[PDB]
Design a protein around this motif. Structure first.
Motif, PDB file in Angstrom:
ATOM      1  N   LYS A  14       0.826  -1.202   0.000  1.00  0.00           N
ATOM      2  CA  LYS A  14       0.000   0.000   0.000  1.00  0.00           C
ATOM      3  C   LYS A  14       0.862   1.254   0.000  1.00  0.00           C
ATOM      4  O   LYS A  14       0.547   2.232  -0.689  1.00  0.00           O
ATOM      5  CB  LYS A  14      -0.942  -0.004   1.203  1.00  0.00           C
ATOM      6  CG  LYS A  14      -1.888   1.185   1.243  1.00  0.00           C
ATOM      7  CD  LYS A  14      -2.876   1.078   2.390  1.00  0.00           C
ATOM      8  CE  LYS A  14      -2.167   1.079   3.733  1.00  0.00           C
ATOM      9  NZ  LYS A  14      -3.136   1.046   4.862  1.00  0.00           N
ATOM     10  N   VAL A  67       0.808   4.482  -2.513  1.00  0.00           N
ATOM     11  CA  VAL A  67       0.584   5.839  -2.019  1.00  0.00           C
ATOM     12  C   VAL A  67       1.671   6.778  -2.525  1.00  0.00           C
ATOM     13  O   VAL A  67       1.388   7.877  -3.017  1.00  0.00           O
ATOM     14  CB  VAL A  67       0.506   5.844  -0.482  1.00  0.00           C
ATOM     15  CG1 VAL A  67       0.485   7.268   0.040  1.00  0.00           C
ATOM     16  CG2 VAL A  67      -0.725   5.090  -0.014  1.00  0.00           C
ATOM     17  N   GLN A  78       1.278   7.583  -6.141  1.00  0.00           N
ATOM     18  CA  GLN A  78       0.001   8.205  -6.491  1.00  0.00           C
ATOM     19  C   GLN A  78      -0.882   7.253  -7.298  1.00  0.00           C
ATOM     20  O   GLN A  78      -1.658   7.673  -8.158  1.00  0.00           O
ATOM     21  CB  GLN A  78       0.210   9.523  -7.239  1.00  0.00           C
ATOM     22  CG  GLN A  78       0.972  10.565  -6.441  1.00  0.00           C
ATOM     23  CD  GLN A  78       1.039  11.903  -7.146  1.00  0.00           C
ATOM     24  OE1 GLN A  78       0.540  12.056  -8.260  1.00  0.00           O
ATOM     25  NE2 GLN A  78       1.657  12.884  -6.498  1.00  0.00           N
ATOM     26  N   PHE A 108      -3.675   5.728  -6.593  1.00  0.00           N
ATOM     27  CA  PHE A 108      -4.767   5.714  -5.627  1.00  0.00           C
ATOM     28  C   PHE A 108      -5.789   4.630  -5.939  1.00  0.00           C
ATOM     29  O   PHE A 108      -6.415   4.090  -5.019  1.00  0.00           O
ATOM     30  CB  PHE A 108      -5.434   7.086  -5.583  1.00  0.00           C
ATOM     31  CG  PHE A 108      -4.491   8.200  -5.231  1.00  0.00           C
ATOM     32  CD1 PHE A 108      -3.435   7.980  -4.363  1.00  0.00           C
ATOM     33  CD2 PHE A 108      -4.650   9.460  -5.777  1.00  0.00           C
ATOM     34  CE1 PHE A 108      -2.563   8.998  -4.039  1.00  0.00           C
ATOM     35  CE2 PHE A 108      -3.782  10.483  -5.457  1.00  0.00           C
ATOM     36  CZ  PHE A 108      -2.736  10.251  -4.587  1.00  0.00           C
ATOM     37  N   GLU A 109      -5.976   4.298  -7.218  1.00  0.00           N
ATOM     38  CA  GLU A 109      -6.896   3.222  -7.570  1.00  0.00           C
ATOM     39  C   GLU A 109      -6.442   1.897  -6.972  1.00  0.00           C
ATOM     40  O   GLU A 109      -7.256   1.135  -6.437  1.00  0.00           O
ATOM     41  CB  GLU A 109      -7.022   3.107  -9.089  1.00  0.00           C
ATOM     42  CG  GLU A 109      -7.497   4.375  -9.780  1.00  0.00           C
ATOM     43  CD  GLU A 109      -6.368   5.346 -10.065  1.00  0.00           C
ATOM     44  OE1 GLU A 109      -5.192   4.959  -9.902  1.00  0.00           O
ATOM     45  OE2 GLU A 109      -6.657   6.495 -10.457  1.00  0.00           O
ATOM     46  N   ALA A 132      -4.468   1.741  -4.378  1.00  0.00           N
ATOM     47  CA  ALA A 132      -4.437   1.931  -2.932  1.00  0.00           C
ATOM     48  C   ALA A 132      -5.755   1.517  -2.291  1.00  0.00           C
ATOM     49  O   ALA A 132      -5.766   0.899  -1.221  1.00  0.00           O
ATOM     50  CB  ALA A 132      -4.113   3.387  -2.601  1.00  0.00           C
ATOM     51  N   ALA A 133      -6.877   1.859  -2.926  1.00  0.00           N
ATOM     52  CA  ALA A 133      -8.175   1.462  -2.390  1.00  0.00           C
ATOM     53  C   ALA A 133      -8.321  -0.054  -2.371  1.00  0.00           C
ATOM     54  O   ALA A 133      -8.842  -0.623  -1.404  1.00  0.00           O
ATOM     55  CB  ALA A 133      -9.297   2.099  -3.206  1.00  0.00           C
ATOM     56  N   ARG A 164      -6.251  -1.412   0.415  1.00  0.00           N
ATOM     57  CA  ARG A 164      -6.816  -1.037   1.707  1.00  0.00           C
ATOM     58  C   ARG A 164      -7.933  -1.988   2.115  1.00  0.00           C
ATOM     59  O   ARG A 164      -8.016  -2.399   3.278  1.00  0.00           O
ATOM     60  CB  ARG A 164      -7.326   0.402   1.657  1.00  0.00           C
ATOM     61  CG  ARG A 164      -7.944   0.886   2.954  1.00  0.00           C
ATOM     62  CD  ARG A 164      -8.432   2.318   2.825  1.00  0.00           C
ATOM     63  NE  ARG A 164      -9.410   2.461   1.755  1.00  0.00           N
ATOM     64  CZ  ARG A 164     -10.718   2.301   1.912  1.00  0.00           C
ATOM     65  NH1 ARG A 164     -11.241   1.992   3.087  1.00  0.00           N
ATOM     66  NH2 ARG A 164     -11.519   2.456   0.863  1.00  0.00           N
TER      67      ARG A 164
END
Lengths: 69, 69
Positions: free
Chosen positions: B18, B22, B25, B27-28, B30-31, B34
């Motif tokens: 993760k 991050v 960048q 972010f797609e 990262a979700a 998560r």
């Protein structure tokens, strides 16, 4: 000329908004903000370049009016 | 019993993974990571609780063989 001012301000608030998303692990919104910031900067470069390009179109010269002031 | 170890190891590499998203960048991704980390920790709590539930079922006794060793 009152254009790059507000555009730069939007870039600032967008960057802060993305930072809040990153610290909150809201990556779904963060991904959208990242693309939005790139859109703002892309038009920011073009708006600034055309402004300084038009600046060279005219030459600023002194006059007795300026010295009178 | 080789159950909390393997779960913890997967959680560890997910946490590092993760961080890679991050800082990049992504972010797609990262979700997605998560959600996976939360799912793994959910299993970790259940497995850890049921492990000591079975452990509390029996009581360890000191056989004379242990003293002999």
């Amino acid at each position: 000329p009152n254009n790059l001012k507000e555009i730069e301000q939007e870039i600032e608030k967008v960057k802060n908004e993305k930072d809040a998303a990153v610290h909150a692990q809201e990556f779904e919104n963060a991904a959208n903000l990242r693309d939005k910031q790139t859109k703002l900067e892309k038009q920011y470069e073009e708006a600034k370049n055309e402004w300084k390009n038009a600046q060279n179109g005219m030459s600023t010269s002194l006059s007795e009016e300026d010295i009178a002031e």
